[PDB]
């Protein structure tokens, strides 16, 4: 069908039941919920094909499912642990193995809410030498501090997202590796020509889109509470 | 005792060359068989499937597959590996008349042909007026490779290759810092083994 998945990120602290939704519109009998973890492939949770007929897949563990309807297939956490930290897919398939994939749902969750923390986003400029000796213009963008790894960056040059030019790195590094709760660290390079690198009225913006708590969460600390939001950092070209 | 078996979770294609991605199931009567992509940040796409109708399946994009029942092999093909080729690939097969079951994903690199390489290492700095600062070594070829930092209060990142549309250019980066007074990026990628000829700015 159109599949459907709600919602599409979410975090969470361990111990508390979770709920996930695939909804359908085309009606087949046979829908599927699984997970995706780096190294894994796509493991099979549950499975079902009509109404109350449910099926283990091979990690079915701490997970439960209901098929409260033709058109929906309802995946919950029972108790949440750190290890169920996925991308989770539901699927559908008609009878000759025709398969649709939702768009996945990010879910974290961690142990400690008083952990969670944005990032903070710098832009490094253009070296003159690299200038000169190649007449391009490299920027670099450092998010740094934040916690949990559940980001996205972006680089927005006069005011249009760009992908052109652009690495990000693909997983962000742990900033303390001896700790299980260590913030993380992410650097993006975002390359130009040395002439639009050179021109002041060019405009050159990292974006970091940061998933961390609900309005709805409790926030006991002085420091800012660590909402869902955006952090960026900017820099305009320079001729000097 | 259905199963899936994919080769290598990493694999590298020199820009150009043959793409070739391997997969074989265990299954004693022949499945149906599937080739996914994932391309960075999104969702899984099919690419080809086999369904015992063609062994040579041709897929979106120059890609095919042979269905081999002699040697339990599904091999996804395309003729030339392309910057754009880069993203993660699932072989996945039919199991017990009621799923698809995955492997495990190889993740494809695109090594840029990089004909005149100017191996350099960079300092830049902060845009506001802290005196902070990160190095940054690019524009290496093929043949060199970035470490891990032996240094806790240093940090370094794997290489990342960017593709620059506007010259219709390819570069590899890796980006170091540190919070230390000690640090100066001459200093910075120490511990890799670079090419002879880096250029050092002053």
């Known amino acids: 069908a159109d599949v459907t998945q709600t919602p599409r990120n979410r975090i969470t602290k361990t111990g508390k039941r979770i709920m996930l939704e695939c909804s359908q519109t085309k009606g087949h009998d046979r829908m599927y919920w699984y997970r995706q973890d780096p190294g894994l492939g796509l493991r099979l949770i549950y499975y079902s094909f009509d109404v109350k007929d449910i099926n283990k897949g091979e990690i079915s563990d701490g997970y439960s499912v209901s098929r409260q309807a033709q058109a929906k297939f309802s995946l919950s956490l029972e108790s949440a642990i750190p290890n169920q930290t996925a991308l989770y897919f539901c699927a559908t398939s008609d009878e000759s193995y025709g398969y649709t994939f939702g768009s996945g749902t990010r879910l974290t969750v961690v142990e400690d809410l008083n952990k969670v923390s944005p990032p903070e986003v710098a832009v490094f400029e253009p070296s003159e030498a690299e200038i000169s000796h190649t007449q391009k213009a490299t920027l670099v963008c450092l998010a740094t501090g934040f916690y949990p790894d559940h980001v996205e960056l972006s680089w927005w040059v006069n005011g249009k997202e760009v992908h052109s030019g652009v690495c990000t790195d693909p997983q962000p590094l742990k900033e303390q590796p001896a700790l299980n709760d260590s913030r993380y660290s992410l650097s993006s390079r975002l390359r130009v020509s040395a002439t639009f690198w050179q021109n002041p009225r060019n405009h050159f913006r990292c974006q970091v889109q940061f998933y961390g708590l609900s309005e709805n969460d409790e926030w006991t600390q002085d420091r800012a509470k660590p909402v869902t939001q955006i952090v960026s950092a900017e820099a305009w070209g320079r001729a000097d | 005792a259905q199963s899936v078996t994919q080769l290598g979770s990493h694999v590298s294609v020199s820009e150009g060359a043959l793409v070739l991605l391997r997969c074989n199931y265990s299954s004693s009567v022949p499945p149906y068989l599937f080739w996914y992509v994932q391309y960075p940040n999104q969702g899984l796409q099919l690419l080809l499937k086999y369904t015992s109708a063609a062994t040579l399946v041709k897929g979106i994009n120059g890609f095919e597959a042979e269905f081999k029942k002699s040697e339990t092999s599904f091999h996804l093909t395309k003729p030339s590996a392309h910057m754009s080729d880069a993203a993660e690939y699932f072989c996945?097969?039919?199991?017990?008349?009621?799923?698809?079951?995955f492997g495990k994903g190889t993740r494809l690199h695109i090594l840029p042909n990089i004909q005149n390489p100017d191996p350099a290492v960079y300092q830049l700095r902060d845009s506001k007026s802290s005196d902070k600062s990160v190095c940054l070594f690019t524009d290496f070829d093929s043949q060199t490779n970035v470490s891990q930092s032996k240094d806790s209060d240093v940090y370094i990142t794997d290489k990342c290759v960017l593709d620059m549309r506007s010259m219709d250019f390819k570069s590899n980066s890796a980006v170091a810092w540190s919070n230390k007074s000690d640090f100066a990026c001459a200093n910075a990628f120490n511990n890799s083994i670079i090419p002879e000829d880096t250029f050092f700015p002053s």
């Open positions: 996945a097969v039919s199991e017990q008349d009621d799923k698809i079951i």
